[PDB]
Design a protein around this ligand. Structure first.
Ligand code: CU
Length: 224
C-alpha cells in the first residue's frame, strides 16, 4: 500500500515560500512524475518576479517519492510508504563560505495530485557572493543522496553535498543535511543504508516571459 499510488504517471504541484536576507519570493511548480522509471518533468515559475537567488540553489528543495526503487530494493522505499498520508522533509543547507537555507516541507497526496509545500528561510548570505549576486552557471551536476534509517524518529536522515558551477570556473559547495518523518501514525518502511543516484537537466521554456526553470530529472536507488 502506498506503492500502488505510483504505478504510472502522477501529477505534481510544488509551492515554495522563501525568505532570504529580507528578500522574499514564491515559486510554483507543475508537472508529472513517474517512479517506475524515476523521472520528473517540471516547469517552475517565479510568481513574485525575478529571484533574489539563483534557481539551481532551489533545485534540491523544489518529491523524492518519485525516486525509482528497483524490485529487490522495494522494501527500502521510505518515501512511498509514508503515502498517501505523506511525510515531512526538513533540511539545513550550508553554503560553504556563504549563508545557509533552512527548509521545511510537507509532501502528501491531495486528491489526484502529489503536492510538495515548502518553507525556506535563508540567513547570512553575503550580498555580491555567489548566491546573492547570481554567479552560478545555469546547470546541474550528478549527485548521490546518502540515506540512513532514523529509527527513533520513525523516519530517515540523508547527507550529500551539491556541486554548483560558478561562472568564473570555481565550484560552490552546498552541504545538505536532511530529515524525513511521516505525517501519519505508521507503520512505515525503514531502509538499510543506501543512496539515490540523481541526474538533472535545467533548461528554459522559450515561450515563457516570466522568470522560470524547466527541469528534467532522473533518480534511481542503489547501494544494496
Ligand atoms: Cu512568505
Amino acid at each position: 500500500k502506498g506503492e500502488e499510488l505510483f504505478t504510472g504517471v502522477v501529477p505534481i504541484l510544488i509551492e515554495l515560500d522563501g525568505h532570504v536576507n529580507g528578500h522574499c519570493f514564491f515559486v510554483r511548480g507543475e508537472g508529472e512524475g513517474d517512479a517506475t522509471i524515476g523521472k520528473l518533468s517540471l516547469k517552475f515559475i517565479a510568481t513574485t518576479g525575478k529571484l533574489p537567488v539563483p534557481w539551481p540553489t532551489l533545485v534540491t528543495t523544489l518529491v523524492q517519492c518519485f525516486s525509482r526503487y528497483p524490485d529487490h530494493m522495494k522494501r527500502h522505499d521510505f518515501f512511498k510508504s509514508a503515502m498517501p498520508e505523506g511525510y515531512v522533509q526538513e533540511r539545513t543547507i550550508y553554503f560553504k563560505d556563504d549563508g545557509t537555507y533552512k527548509t521545511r516541507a510537507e509532501v502528501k497526496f491531495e486528491g489526484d495530485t502529489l503536492v510538495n509545500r515548502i518553507e525556506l528561510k535563508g540567513i547570512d548570505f553575503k550580498e555580491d557572493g555567489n548566491i546573492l549576486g547570481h554567479k552560478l552557471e545555469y546547470n546541474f551536476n550528478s549527485h548521490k543522496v546518502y540515506i540512513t534509517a532514523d529509527k527513533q524518529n520513525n523516519g530517515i536522515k540523508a547527507n550529500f553535498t551539491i556541486r554548483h558551477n560558478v561562472e568564473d570556473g570555481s565550484v560552490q559547495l552546498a552541504d545538505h543535511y536532511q530529515q524525513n518523518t511521516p505525517i501519519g501514525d505508521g507503520p512505515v518502511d525503514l531502509p538499510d543504508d543506501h543512496y539515490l543516484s540523481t541526474q538533472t537537466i535545467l533548461s528554459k521554456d522559450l515561450n515563457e516571459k516570466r522568470d522560470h526553470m524547466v527541469l528534467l530529472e532522473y533518480v534511481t536507488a542503489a547501494g544494496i
